[model samples]
Target: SDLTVSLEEASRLESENVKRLRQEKRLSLIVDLDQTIIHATVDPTVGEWMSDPGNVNYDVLRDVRSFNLQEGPSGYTSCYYIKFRPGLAQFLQKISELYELHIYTMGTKAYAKEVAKIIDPTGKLFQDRVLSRDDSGSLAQKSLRRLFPCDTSMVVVIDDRGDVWDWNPNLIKVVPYEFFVGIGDINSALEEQNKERVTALELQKSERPLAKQQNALLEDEGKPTPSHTLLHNRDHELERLEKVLKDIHAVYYEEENDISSRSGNHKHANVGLIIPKMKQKVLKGCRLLFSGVIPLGVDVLSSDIAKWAMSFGAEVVLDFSVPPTHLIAAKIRTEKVKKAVSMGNIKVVKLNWLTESLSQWKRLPESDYLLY
Candidate 1:
């Protein structure tokens, strides 16, 4: 823990960060590389397509870029092909005006640098604020505290996957960019292998190293097949994601203006506070209770699911002590589900009712998730 900042040091650094952010009038934006903004593959098939301009997928491949890296234990060198998410350049350019960009990727330092050359060629966008896996403490998980040190009040994370970040309230999970068929995060193999080793010791099982086979399959066998040749990427994800970032930035400043008034001191507005309140408006009048959705022994009020509900302005109840407007049931005939049906007023909805509403940022119709 000392290798990283201690709690006290982190708090000190966070104060400096907050002051610097206020001076710049920009929030910190943590950008995820693989599958969030770019899709990369080691498959030579993509290289072949790039060379052949007449190829069916040439339109997409034309913009694809490649770089060589020395990887593996034997230091074998290989070429990696990468494709930017559609509208990525414009997205970065526009958002950089309102946010100080930082790269937080699971890829190695060298790999992150190579990708940066293509994404931010002028070096003005990211400008050396890159944190790679070599520096990231845990392999499987990414923590905002790793970069922000302590306060994440002004930081926002945009990653394709939420699980990696433990679904932190600051994350704006994006739809994963799957340009290469069956090709997932290039750096994910190492994390999974480490996880496998850890689990093997915990279970006292034979460490047969199945992860080796998985890695081999991931890199070699998962190459794009003939069925995936067309590579039709009409992804408008960046455009939508840009709008969300802009809204967050706009709201942060709006609150900052309010803070400048005599009633409020000269405090900088925090996106951490602003974003949650904006989300609360979505489910403003709903009262919700979870059944089979949360694990036992965890604090109901502080659990990730409950916090997510509260962020959306829904009231989370422990039991029938107070009547809930909706019952989020993972099972069809659980005790809570039966009680909800008997009680008659509470709408029994599937887990998707909560998940979809959060992702879409709207209170979806109850009929869609009703457990009839």
Candidate 2:
């Protein structure tokens, strides 16, 4: 009887230890919906089609698109949307198995729930832990504080928006917007190699001495702590710099290969692509065409500039039959303009030169043009 009692006590102790270990090992994940777990259809309400020259609903479409209510109150008949990329559902499922998935969305609660249902009908992907702008007073920081009271070192947040990183520097991990595409195939690879490490790397580099110094100065004045605000501003500034670097790298390296062969030998051969024009606008619209081809955040290509011009109510048309526009703007380094005089039918007018001198334009401009 004594021997049996001792064995039973040992077994009970082991069970308790296992339960504690399991509790300690629980993993939590906060995932974004749009552009993260599931890519929503392009917000078609704002683009050229929405504002087509003769469209009667242009104003309504524009307003709806800005608010991300492209479908509007009427429902599916008006909204024709599809996932930007495929295989997102599978990826979300796999990741959910490895962690406790919680939905953190900037979208409205109803829309986010509907979208989540589309991705995972069983509600297994996130288990209805969906949070929206309504949950945290629509402030990301406030939402984070309310949603994540525990230490963030164990949490992973995946989102398409770069702004989220500004709020939570200690974020366990981040899957950038670009990585969401084709994520299903790479789900295993990401979990095995990318997940913990990718996020840990960001956390490791979160400290900014300059920011710390600024925070100290503010603290000495008996003013309220502005740590979060300072970090947010710093993150935005850093992101802007990253975009500028990408643009510069693209211009210096990739532009040469993009130009036509006829003008390949010239030092300023790639100038045609970088020149600001309406064509650049188009490229921005059809982002997939150049996703991996060009560095992210580079100034829009000439073709894209054209699209922007058209979108902004410009009437310029690209006709193959007509002579190409002349290069009124000279290349900065060579002081010469290639293809300055092509077919004579179309005149090349450099816009913005009258209002702001070319020299002033050439100065390193701010990269945060997205706000406009």
Indicate which candidate wins on TM-score. 1
Clashes of each: 0, 20
Per-residue error at 113 for model 1, in Å? 1.1
Superposed by TM-score, candidate 2 places the C-alpha of residue 49 at a distance from the truth, in angstroms, of 13
TM-scores for every candidate against the unseen true structure: 0.72, 0.34
Candidate 1: segments with Cα more than 4 A from true spot: 1-17, 43-61, 76-78, 189-231, 261-266, 287-310, 315-324, 327-344, 348-350, 369-371
Candidate 2 local lDDT, 1-372, one digit each (tens): 998998778667654443342345334556666545443323233243355655432332332222233222334222323232233544555455445667877655666766666666788667768886556454333234455442232344545443454423323222333311222211113233434433332332243222343345556655454431221111122233223323433453444445455642244322123433312332232111111222345543444333333322233322333333322232221112223224333323333321122112231221221111
Worst 10 residues of 1 by lDDT: 202-211
Q: Which TM-score value belongs to model 1?
A: 0.72
lDDT of 1 by residue, 1-372 (tens): 785568667677778777777778789999999999998877666776678887756777888999988754445465778899999999999999989999999887888999999998999999999988878876779998788765687899899877788767788877788887556666666746645533433232132122232344445554554343447678888998989999998888777756755622245677777777778799898989999888888877878777767767889998999999999998659889999899999999998988888777889998988994
Each candidate's lDDT (Cα)? 0.79, 0.38
Q: CA lDDT of 204 in candidate 2? A: 24
Poorest lDDT segment (10 consecutive residues) of candidate 2: 363-372
